[PDB]
Amino acid sequence: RHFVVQFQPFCYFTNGTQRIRYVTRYIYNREEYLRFDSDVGEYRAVTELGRPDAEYYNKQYLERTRAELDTVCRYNYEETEVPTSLRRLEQPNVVISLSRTEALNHHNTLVCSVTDFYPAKIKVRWFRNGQEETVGVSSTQLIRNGDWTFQVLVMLEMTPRRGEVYTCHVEHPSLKSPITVEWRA
Amino acid sequence: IEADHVGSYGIVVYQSPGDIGQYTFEFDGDELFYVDLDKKETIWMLPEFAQLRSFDPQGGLQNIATGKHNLGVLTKRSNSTPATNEAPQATVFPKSPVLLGQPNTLICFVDNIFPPVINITWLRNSKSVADGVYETSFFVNRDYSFHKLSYLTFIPSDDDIYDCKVEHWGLEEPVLKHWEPE
């Protein structure tokens, strides 16, 4: 009925353009069969479907492929990413909310919603009256919105009591000074 | 494989029947662009990036032609083995905390998509919505399947119900992921 092919090229960067590992996969439906790995510097077959192509690619364009690790990868990074993806900054929005309606000694749950930031690097911490809550905190995995922004929700198990001040602390590369959002009984 | 960054410059997907192809550039799991094959145009997700860089859509067409060439050449070499359908997985969540009257966006994440052909739509109060809808291309996964996202801009209100309708050969009946302002 349906048949597909896939060509997935990957420029793996590490510490800038230092440990660049250029790879290139060849897929049929949902199965890889051929590959160019910068680490092995040569083509190799992953499954039977690849034997028939091995030697052919190495003879036809290996000099061209190795070449791209610098004319594509390294170049793109230092020439196109540096001023776009690596520069892009989106400050997170931090809001605090309570799962249940307010009360004076009923156990509820504070939720610190940290949204729309980029890059993914972020640090969120809960504080009660000034000290780091290290008991009933939990959080969602980092969520990728698919639009070049991330979000994360950090929950705190607690019980509202007058005079108490809870603070959500957040540090991000987009921020000159951390963000703190308070919530009070 | 570990790394500080990952760039996929020229992902090609070519399917048949239909001569259905996609050409994308990804960086750190987000989509830089896809090339509109019919319009021969590189469509950037973040318009402002096109001010500081570019890509000749010609590149896409060429590489897609190769996808055409390799499919079939590979289809026979495999004795016409058909693609096994997968059942998608949808999850709905808002971009930011919901506040009555404040424009927001519902995100429908659809994972384990295979093959890369699918129908994602939105229903408001159970009636069809076309306006304020946007969706991404098919992103590659590790198991070589795909994921895609659909976006619905909307105004939160007390009495409102939304569903994300997904249709795939892998599903016997169209999955509906429902959502409402809790």
């Binding site: 028939p52 192509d53 052919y56 791209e68 793109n76 020439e79 | 590489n63």
Partner: peptide, 12 residues
Amino acid sequence: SRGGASQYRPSQ
């Protein structure tokens, strides 16, 4: 300036 794509190589 102009980004570069990773040539998708055609088999036999």
